[PDB]
Amino acid sequence: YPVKTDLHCRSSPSTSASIVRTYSSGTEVQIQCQTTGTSVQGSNVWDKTQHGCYVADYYVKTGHSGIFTTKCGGSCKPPPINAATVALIKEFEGFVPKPAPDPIGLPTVGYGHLCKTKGCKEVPYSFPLTQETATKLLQSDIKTFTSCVSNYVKDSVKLNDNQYGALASWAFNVGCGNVQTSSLIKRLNAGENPNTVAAQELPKWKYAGGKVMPGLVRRRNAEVALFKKPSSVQAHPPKC
Ligand SMILES: [K+]
């Protein structure tokens, strides 16, 4: 069932409970079970979703007002990437304020955003982009990659925000399928010291067309330096 608005998914069926994640308008939810809690726009019905958190049923488009399924009788979103990670991706992707005017093939904008159309009008920000809107665009794009990193790395392997951000930057560059089959993920999951794994594995990802690319050597070195940058903030597994 689609949510009718940006809808908070809470740890209990209560507007006072902590927010586990927020579903954007139109996102599909599957209802495990329903319960009663805080009245929202005249309905006290709350739905437990596929993520194990609770949403106000008023904002889920089901065709029902009352409880219609099992009575009851979460999983934190990966965090946004930090400032240092954004700065690294901007260094290596550059900044493009507007799409090339009449492009051959699909253009880029912002910080390495590949457009789906030549006009790129499906991007939800006005052209030209500013540093602010390029960053928001990047935070949206990077969700694919923080999601797959956080999926493939075991939850017993704690990564700080710099480590997580470095992997997100790598993943964005190489794609999730490559992350999944990487020795990097394998060695992290075997319990090897993360900084050692990163330092040894990331520099291997330097080849294009059988040829070592200086730009990739440079990027992997910057990703290694970010990975090893000390932090006491845990990013993986997510906390909420
Ligand atoms: K995981």
Residue numbers in the entry: 1 to 73, 79 to 245
From the paper:
Here, we report the identification of several new fungal GH24s with this CWBD and the structure of the intact T. saccata enzyme, henceforth referred to as TsCWBD-GH24. The linker, G73-SSSGGG-S80, appears to be flexible: its electron density is ill defined and it was not initially obvious how to assign the domains which compose a monomer. This was resolved by inspection of the surface, which strongly suggested a likely choice of connectivity for the domain pairs. While it is possible that the relative positions of the two domains is flexible in solution and that this particular orientation is a result of the crystal packing, we note that the linker is relatively short in this enzyme. The overall fold of the T. saccata catalytic GH24 domain follows that of the homologous GH24 enzymes. There is a clear decrease in activity when the CWBD is removed.
